[PDB]
Amino acid sequence: THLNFTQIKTAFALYWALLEAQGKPVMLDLYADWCVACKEFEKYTFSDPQVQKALADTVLLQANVTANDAQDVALLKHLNVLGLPTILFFDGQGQEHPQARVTGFMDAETFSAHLRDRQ
Amino acid sequence: ETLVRPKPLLLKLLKSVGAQKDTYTMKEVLFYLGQYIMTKRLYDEKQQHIVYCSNDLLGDLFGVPSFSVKEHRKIYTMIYRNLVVV
């Protein structure tokens, strides 16, 4: 019903996660409760089984910064995130493509277009 | 991904973050390794991709005073240099 994302807290966890991928391309969803756009994203777009298959070759990560605590802000500052929602993409060597940041809501279709601008 | 037997030292570390096995997949070894660094807090709080092993078993085991998690291949080789295969 929901996509399978491994949770991350610290920037370390992210960097270690990029190592564990090695080769696979990566997607990082920042998430919070107080971010409606994020829960909208989760429920409508990541359920859609077209999306789900375009990501089946792609490793899936999620940070929950709902707490906006110190480890949450350090992560966000280091990543240079301005506000949620924000979704980050990495090529197989673990370098973010910043062009391909998503900073807003998208439906199943629009997302799959942006997955023609990934990696 | 594929099955491997950690050498005495990499096993002694691995048992320390709650692995009880003698034979692991790769993704496992990488996971329990990440955990050891989180546990002992061997990463710099400012630049979290930087790891200080000088003065810790991981230094002796990787044979470097420090490294960046950003250098995937190097770490992969430092690990593999402590395994064997079924």
Numbering used by the authors:
A (entry chain B): 10 to 128
B (entry chain A): 11 to 96
Copy the relevant paper text.
Here, we present a computational protein design strategy to repurpose drug-inhibited protein-protein interactions as OFF- and ON-switches. The designed binders and drug-receptors form chemically-disruptable heterodimers (CDH) which dissociate in the presence of small molecules. Therefore, we devised a strategy to design chemically-controlled switches by repurposing protein components and small molecules involved in the inhibition of protein-protein interactions (PPI). Previously, we reported the design of chemically disruptable heterodimers (CDH) from known protein: peptide-motif complexes, by transferring the peptide motif from the disordered binding partner to globular proteins and using the known PPI inhibitor as a chemical disruptor.
To further expand the panel of CDHs and the chemical space of small-molecule disruptors, we designed a novel CDH-3, based on the starting point of the interaction between p53 and mdm2. Particularly, the dihydroisoquinoline derivative, NVP-CGM097 (Drug-3), is currently undergoing phase 1 clinical trials. We performed a structural search over approximately 11,000 putative protein scaffolds and after the design stage we selected for experimental characterization three designs which we refer to as LD4, LD5 and LD6. From these three designs, LD6 a design based on a thioredoxin protein from mouse, showed the best biochemical behavior being monomeric in solution and a melting temperature of 62 ˚C. LD6 bound to mdm2 with a Kd of 4 nM as determined by SPR, showing a higher binding affinity than those reported for the wild-type p5317-29 peptide (820±60 nM) or the stapled p53 peptide which we used as the input peptide motif (12±3 nM). Next, we tested if Drug-3 promoted the dissociation of the mdm2:LD6 complex by SPR and determined an IC50 of 106 nM. These results were also confirmed using SEC-MALS where the drug dissociated the complex into two monomers. To evaluate the structural accuracy of the designed CDH-3, we solved the crystal structure of the mdm2:LD6 complex at 2.9 Å resolution by X-ray crystallography. The structure of the complex closely matched our computational model, with backbone RMSDs of 0.37 Å over the overall structure and 0.24 Å over the p53 motif region. The conformation of key residues observed in the native interface were closely mimicked in the crystal structure of LD6 in complex with mdm2.
